[PDB]
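Lab notebook, bench 4. We co-purified these components, and the gel suggests they stay together. Before we commit to crystallization screens, I want a quick structural picture of the whole thing.
Request: model the full complex, all chains together.
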Amino acid sequence: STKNGRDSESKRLGAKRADGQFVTGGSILYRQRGTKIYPGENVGRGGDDTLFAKIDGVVKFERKGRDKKQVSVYAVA
Amino acid sequence: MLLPKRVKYRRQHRPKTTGRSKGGNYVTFGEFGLQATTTSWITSRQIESARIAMTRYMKRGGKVWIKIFPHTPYTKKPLEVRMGAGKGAVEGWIAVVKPGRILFEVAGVSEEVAREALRLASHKLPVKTKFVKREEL
Amino acid sequence: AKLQITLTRSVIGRPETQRKTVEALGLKKTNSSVVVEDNPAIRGQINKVKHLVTVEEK
Amino acid sequence: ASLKSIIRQGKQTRSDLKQLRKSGKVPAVVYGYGTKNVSVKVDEVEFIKVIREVGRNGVIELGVGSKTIKVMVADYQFDPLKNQITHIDFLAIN
RNA sequence: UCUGGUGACUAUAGCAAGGAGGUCACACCUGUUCCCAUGCCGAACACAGAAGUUAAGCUCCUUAGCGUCGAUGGUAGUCGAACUUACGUUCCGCUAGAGUAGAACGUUGCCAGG
RNA sequence: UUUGGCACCUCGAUGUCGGCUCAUCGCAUCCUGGGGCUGUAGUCGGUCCCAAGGGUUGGGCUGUUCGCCCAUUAAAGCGGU
RNA sequence: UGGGGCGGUCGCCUCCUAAAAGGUAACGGAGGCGCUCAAAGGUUCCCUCAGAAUGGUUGGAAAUCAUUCAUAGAGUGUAAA
RNA sequence: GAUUAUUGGAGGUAGAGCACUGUUUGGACGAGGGGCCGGUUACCGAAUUCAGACAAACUCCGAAUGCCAAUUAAUUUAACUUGGGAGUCAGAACAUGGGUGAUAAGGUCCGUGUUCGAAAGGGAAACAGCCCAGACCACCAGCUAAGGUCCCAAAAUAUAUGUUAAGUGGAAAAGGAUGUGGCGUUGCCCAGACAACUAGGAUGUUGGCUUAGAAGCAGCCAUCAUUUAAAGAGUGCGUAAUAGCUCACUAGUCGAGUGACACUGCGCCGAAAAUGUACCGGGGCUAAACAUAUUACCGAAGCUGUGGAUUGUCCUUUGGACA
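Here is the predicted assembly.
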């Protein structure tokens, strides 16, 4: 017999909005464990480490230092 | 009889055989060497047989290096039984070699002796081989 | 400036990406043709699907 | 120690490179102070003879078009499976 | 336009070594009366001073020594196509990593003194 | 030609093993035939090569396929259908 | 359920398989959960690795104590990421 | 909505690499046990270092492509919302990326494409899944695709240049050999090469351990001058030991070509199964095979030409223009 037939339901992690598109003021941007991506301007961080927009604007992924990344939102319209 | 003292995972995917040698394509320790020309697995008994046949012809003379180690285990079901009730038990240990790979090096002995000893070794192996020296130029 | 494209090989046995590129170029049946002005976009479509078409300046 | 070289023109493709290697030629570069970086071709047999006569770490006054350059070998890509050389980098010591 | 304070740049900015400097600044410095404080201690923090020093930190200069960045050319791998079934070949395009040449011993915004 | 692995035809049916009768094919040759070598003196034997024309026993104990034994034989061949 | 049976398993979480978005199967390969905490929660202040030698009462050689590198190899209630 | 161009972004695969984790081969270095009196000597395990290797559950790095989306621009024609009606939930092969299995299966399980399913036609001898290509209907019209042009059986016994001599073509491998072509590198010579004739084969010397004696030979040699144009304390046949003539040398004749390496293309052997030649489809082929080019022709229900149904989208000529 065997004892290896288990696995968990895959969670739909990763990017949910792209660099350059307009979003509304509560939209999810990146779901992950921990902080692969940090939050930037007008971007929040939830209890599930989820990233969301505070306001309506276009989303920009950018670097933070040498080895880190963040998202930001800017209200140009 | 060569094998590792321990492995994290006992059951592994069988390796890949397409391509050329990632490394180990030049003699570094000795004067002469046996380079591979085709691709196959070597099963840790073939190495022993070749080493013995190459040692006794040199008669406790020069020095021999084995540039290959079987890190990878392969499985086998003992009796031909139904398919698919889990993966089988470890049966042996293998190294994969691709064209360019040096298998054995020798030093401290004459060229003709090296050639004959490596010929005797090559006849114990599942892969085509070729005698080579140190690279210059 | 102007290019005459002509579909020489069929579109069957081929992938849907190539099929849709051939459709976007305005070709329906084999040995059917079309005339269009030269742009790098048209050139990209042609370079994608060149094994199926023949092109001439006109 | 008086090698020749022919300058490669722009955009050598895979096919022409391997045709050049089927012939007795080999691609090379020349860089260093005194000149800018140039891509050339060299005869493998003549290069081997020069190396045999001068040594691995030796100087060569090779000809590039109109002029000549004193130069040392930096590195060389070699194919051990068919024992031929496939690329050579030249460094201008001046 | 020298220093300092405070911000922006992926360390090309760091680390290491060598050599010079000071009451306009910076600092080690003296002590625990008071504020305050050390799961013991004025070591640290905090407080009151300016006797003394450039030694250390800090600033300037020098070195590519370690670390960092890093082309060109070439290669591997690969999209597409055509041969084909070879542990593959050919044509077209993208062109890596590693290594080499080399770069660099920081650039710059605001403010007050000087 | 085995024991198996797969599950492609057949479950509105494709007869299971031995034995009898009757055969037919292959050769990877049991006998007979022709040869080389031999640690073949001769008598012989061993091994290898060529070769498929013909031939290749009767009984005891076995359901027994298989196997052991008794007496012969130039030999008591291995397989497929 | 690579016929069925015996055997094993049946929900949830984490890796690999999984082919650089997401998703993706097998009686494929590895492991865990069926809680715990009134501080191991909130806030405000402060603080910072082991290991290594160095070297010394003790000395397990190493427990404690002391200088310096260490780049998270420390540690993070509980598996892995 | 779709495709492409130009831009921006998420991501950790192929590949590489060893900076973490683990696996590993040699080598050094010096410390702890140790072999000993608390110690030397060797040997162990560890650390630090030098150079080399490995990884689905390692990553200092890192593509191609695919994915998301843009003031987005160019070509195309879908897309979405609501509702009425369904059927389906046994899938198969091929190619490619993978697990499993045995780098077995016309095997099995996923993923990416195509075809069949539900697709006739031409080719692959016949052959659902392979190659070409999607049948509205007539025609004793034409151009091509894949595959082909000796006869079966439409079209080149075409041109040009080579390779092969096995019927390879028209069944495999480890290995073994010359049988020929090609590409280099390199050495051999009228001071005559490479065979082959004969002319010399030695001796102080088996000297020494002298071994069953052995004086080319239980097996270790001590392997020295050289009669000489030229030979060895004997290349070598040998050998109970000798008998050894030359393959250790050369004037002599031979009077002209000659070998090593690599690399390479074709071929040969290895190659045995059962009703009857028995995979070239058959005849038969030394080109009618293979390779490289070129030019013609053939070849489908593909495209074109001519005529005719039917219907749709536009003009609104509902003509039936285009499809």
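The longest strand of chain A covers residues 57-63. Worth comparing against the SEC data before the next meeting. The two ends of chain A are 63 Å apart (CA to CA).
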